[PDB]
């Protein structure tokens, strides 16, 4: 379980206790007990052996955080070095935002499947987060072309800010 509930929330399961009002045996319970004893125990033993071997030959890998280079806004046009660094960090942030959108979509699908018949009521916050992140994504990356760039994103943001400022005049 590398994943954490902070980024992939899951409500605690509330399963009811059995109430076997009938006298018949339960083939589901018998098959689950036999399935555990026959399949789950050897698989658990194999995985424990594998994990013991991994703990013997344990190694590590890291994350490689990048630091913020100067952006496209604060250096002169025609300077290909600053433009290159700003373009690379913008493409990096673009890919990160793609995966943020993927995380929100996974969260929404998990909410819908977990709630089932009550998805129209108790998935309100998941749908609200999905709508807000969709609106922000549409504000920053939507109309950019197949040659999307930091310069094009900046031009779109400046046009949107100009329209909002003009609307705020009246």
């Amino acid at each position: 379980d590398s994943w954490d509930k902070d980024v992939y929330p899951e409500p605690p399961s509330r399963t009811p206790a059995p109430s076997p009002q009938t006298s018949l045996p339960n083939p589901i319970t018998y098959l689950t007990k036999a399935y555990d004893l026959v399949v789950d125990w050897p698989v658990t033993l194999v995985r424990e052996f594998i994990e013991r071997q991994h703990a013997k030959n344990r190694t590590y890998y890291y994350h490689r955080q990048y630091r913020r280079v100067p952006d496209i806004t604060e250096c002169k046009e025609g300077d290909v070095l600053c433009i290159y660094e700003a373009e690379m960090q913008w493409r990096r942030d673009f890919k990160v935002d793609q995966e943020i959108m993927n995380i929100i979509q996974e969260r929404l699908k998990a909410c819908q499947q977990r709630e089932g018949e009550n998805y129209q009521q108790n998935c309100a916050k998941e749908l609200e987060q999905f709508t807000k992140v969709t609106k922000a994504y549409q504000d920053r990356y939507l109309d950019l072309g197949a040659y999307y760039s930091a310069r094009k994103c900046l031009a779109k943001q400046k046009q949107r800010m100009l329209e909002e400022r003009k609307a705020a005049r009246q």
Binding site: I72, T73, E74, R151, A155, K156
Partner: protein, 120 residues
Amino acid sequence: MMNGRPGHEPLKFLPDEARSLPPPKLNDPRLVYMGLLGYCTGLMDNMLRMRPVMRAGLHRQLLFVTSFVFAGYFYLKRQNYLYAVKDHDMFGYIKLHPEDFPEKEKKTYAEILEPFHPVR
């Protein structure tokens, strides 16, 4: 267009100012390609005269490769001199006439408003 420059001695292959420039390293792709062209010239000559393509005329192939590398080296040194003196004259003219070549200040991508063309 550079024949009328001051100090142009006529019909001079390599003036002494060329002696100020670093020569080719004698194994650079221009000269290696010139030697390859000489070798191909020898092979094509053998095939046209209907001899064995490489088994025959080893002295001819050696002379071809050597002559191509030799002439290519001296011509390459001359061309390096010509390009160097063209760059020198251009930089000197820039320094002589600064009012015709202003150091234009470019501004950042925070004042210019590039129009945005959506691709809906």
